[PDB]
Amino acid sequence: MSKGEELFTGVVPILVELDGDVNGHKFSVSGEGEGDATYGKLTLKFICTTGKLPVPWPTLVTTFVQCFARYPDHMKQHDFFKSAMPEGYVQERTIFFKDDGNYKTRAEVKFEGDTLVNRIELKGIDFKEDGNILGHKLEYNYNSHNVYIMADKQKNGIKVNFKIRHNIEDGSVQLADHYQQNTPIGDGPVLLPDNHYLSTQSALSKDPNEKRDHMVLLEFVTAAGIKVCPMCSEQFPPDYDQQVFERHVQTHF
Amino acid sequence: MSKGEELFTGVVPILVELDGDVNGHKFSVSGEGEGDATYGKLTLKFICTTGKLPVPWPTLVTTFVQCFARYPDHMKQHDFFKSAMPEGYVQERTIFFKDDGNYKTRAEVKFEGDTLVNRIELKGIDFKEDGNILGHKLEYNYNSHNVYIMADKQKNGIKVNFKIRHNIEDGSVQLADHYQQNTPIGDGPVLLPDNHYLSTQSALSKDPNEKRDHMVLLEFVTAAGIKVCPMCSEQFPPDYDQQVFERHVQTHF
Ligand SMILES: [Zn+2]
Numbered sequence: 020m021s022k023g024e025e026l027f028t029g030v031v032p033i034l035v036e037l038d039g040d041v042n043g044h045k046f047s048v049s050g051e052g053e054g055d056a057t058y059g060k061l062t063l064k065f066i067c068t069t070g071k072l073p074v075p076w077p078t079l080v081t082t083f084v085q086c087f088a089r090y091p092d093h094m095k096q097h098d099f100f101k102s103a104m105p106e107g108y109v110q111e112r113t114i115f116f117k118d119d120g121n122y123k124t125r126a127e128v129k130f131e132g133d134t135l136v137n138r139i140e141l142k143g144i145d146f147k148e149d150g151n152i153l154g155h156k157l158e159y160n161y162n163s164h165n166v167y168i169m170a171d172k173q174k175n176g177i178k179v180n181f182k183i184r185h186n187i188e189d190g191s192v193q194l195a196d197h198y199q200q201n202t203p204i205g206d207g208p209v210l211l212p213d214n215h216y217l218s219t220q221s222a223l224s225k226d227p228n229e230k231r232d233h234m235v236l237l238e239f240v241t242a243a244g245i246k247v248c249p250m251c252s253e254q255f256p257p258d259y260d261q262q263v264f265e266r267h268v269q270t271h272f
Numbered sequence: 273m274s275k276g277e278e279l280f281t282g283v284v285p286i287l288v289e290l291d292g293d294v295n296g297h298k299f300s301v302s303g304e305g306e307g308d309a310t311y312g313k314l315t316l317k318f319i320c321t322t323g324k325l326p327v328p329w330p331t332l333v334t335t336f337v338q339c340f341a342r343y344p345d346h347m348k349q350h351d352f353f354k355s356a357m358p359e360g361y362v363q364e365r366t367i368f369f370k371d372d373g374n375y376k377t378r379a380e381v382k383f384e385g386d387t388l389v390n391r392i393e394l395k396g397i398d399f400k401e402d403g404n405i406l407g408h409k410l411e412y413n414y415n416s417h418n419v420y421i422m423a424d425k426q427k428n429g430i431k432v433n434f435k436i437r438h439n440i441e442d443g444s445v446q447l448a449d450h451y452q453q454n455t456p457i458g459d460g461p462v463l464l465p466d467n468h469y470l471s472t473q474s475a476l477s478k479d480p481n482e483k484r485d486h487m488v489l490l491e492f493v494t495a496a497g498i499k500v501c502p503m504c505s506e507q508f509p510p511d512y513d514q515q516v517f518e519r520h521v522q523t524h525f
Pocket residue numbers: 248249250251252253267268271
């Protein structure tokens with residue numbers, strides 16, 4: 020459905036660079052790994068190159084290449100992200116931490132040679148030095164979420180929203196409301212989609228031989244949101260021939 | 273801290289067999305992959321060898337080898353699972369699905385030759401044909417949970433409990449309360465731990481090539497629950513030198 024699409028048919032190398040400033044605490048993070056959009060799979064490891072991260076690693080999970088989403092055959096028309104490639108897209112976000120500060124981010128994602136590269140600037144303000152973020156009170160894990168996408172034809176792109184729950188130690192949760200826009204860098208045609216979502220799931224781990232402050236991130240990302248026997252609830256592929264299916268339903272009578 | 277411990281030093285291949293019966297619906301699943309206790313990493317793929325699974329895959333996540341948990345060095349005394357290897361342990365569970373039925377499971381985990389093998393029998397009763405489980409209303413994802421472990425000296429074993437949240441489509445959650453016991457199979461000495469937890473995280477995926485009904489499972493499991501500048505909340509290793517640490521604290525004066 021786009022020239023972009025064809026660029027993701029194999030494993031693609033990824034590089035990430037973030038510059039951050041949260042409540043004046045400056046830091047930088049570099050990441051590398053690879054992505055496999057046929058599977059919907061990101062494999063990344065990030066390292067804080069300025070020392071220790073002044074925020075919990077899990078608050079940067081969302082910031083740390085949605086072009087690696089698996090879009091099934093029947094929805095490839097709705098894949099804005101690859102359709103912008105190679106010239107790429109800019110991702111903007113504001114992220115509001117309930118009862119705390121906010122991050123604003125701007126990312127440039129595009130191919131640099133054969134590598135997909137995300138260069139990000141992040142600013143955080145109004146955080147509580149004793150709150151869950153600057154206080155490092157967040158657990159080192161993550162939950163599944165759905166990323167809701169819609170077209171923003173006015174800006175030739177998409178608008179995206181979702182809410183993240185970050186588990187806290189005492190068993191509380193810290194809410195992070197994400198408001199996102201993506202616009203193409205280049206001026207070729209892009210794919211503008213019907214409303215749908217990315218099911219995303221995230222596993223965070225540690226490289227037992229890495230002494231630097233670091234996060235290993237696995238992500239699995241599959242698009243959805245664009246078949247069941249009414250008698251016995253048996254499940255069939257959504258492509259499953261309609262008359263074969265009804266023949267199964269008739270079996271109940 | 274045990275001989276078992278040394279068996280988990282490398283990548284270990286894993287096989288899984290389950291025989292299941294839920295509300296009279298019988299089924300079998302076979303699984304394989306590998307485990308790396310040094311990272312706390314399980315990699316598994318499962319196939320329903322009888323046809324279609326009459327329950328959702330995510331309801332079998334907890335059932336589908338806790339001997340692969342990474343126990344930090346300072347806690348290797350509390351690692352019951354490896355300590356019962358190679359002879360192994362039996363894991364029993366009752367799993368209560370709120371407003372629905374329950375699974376009861378019994379599993380044998382041990383080495384067979386060089387492979388770690390888990391053979392499981394599962395029985396489910398009192399399920400609603402219309403409810404979240406037999407109606408296949410559960411989303412295909414997973415959240416992080418902490419697995420609370422305690423010694424059960426009377427049984428020369430451990431007792432474990434945790435509560436799983438399964439996301440539903442409409443944004444509801446289905447609760448699954450797990451009550452677990454593990455007892456060694458052999459009669460060598462085992463390690464009986466102080467209370468602690470395993471932080472577990474799971475990512476569920478599909479193999480695009482595989483047309484059988486199946487689940488790809490990644491897990492990252494690390495033990496905890498057995499050091500922070502009181503001024504700026506800067507983080508230090510739990511074993512970081514106490515005088516170096518206080519030297520940093522004194523920096524603020
Ligand atoms: Zn039927």
